[PDB]
Amino acid sequence: TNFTIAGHEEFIQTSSPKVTIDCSAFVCSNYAACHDLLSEYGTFCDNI
């Protein structure tokens, strides 16, 4: 018999933070022997 208007809200996620990681600053930040050893176990850093 009688009506009204109701409102609702909805949120849908469409994005995410873009995270970038490197091999040097993570494994061999400031060590030369670390780099010399990492250069022999295969890079895998190009793949990451």
């Binding site: 490197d22 600053a25 930040s29 400031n30």
Partner: protein
């Protein structure tokens, strides 16, 4: 004499000769973004933040 955190790092100490305190903070370390064109001679550098 020494100040530690939950991870075991050193973030402070106390001098023995002068009996004064200090704080230890890590130094800057980061990468640089370079925008390079096909037949360019030198890319454009951007030091973020």
């Amino acid at each position: 004499n020494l100040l530690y955190d939950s991870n075991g790092n050193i973030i402070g100490f106390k001098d023995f000769l002068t009996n004064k305190t200090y704080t230890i903070l890590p130094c800057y370390s980061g990468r640089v973004s370079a925008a390079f064109y096909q037949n360019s001679s030198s890319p454009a550098l951007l030091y973020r933040n």
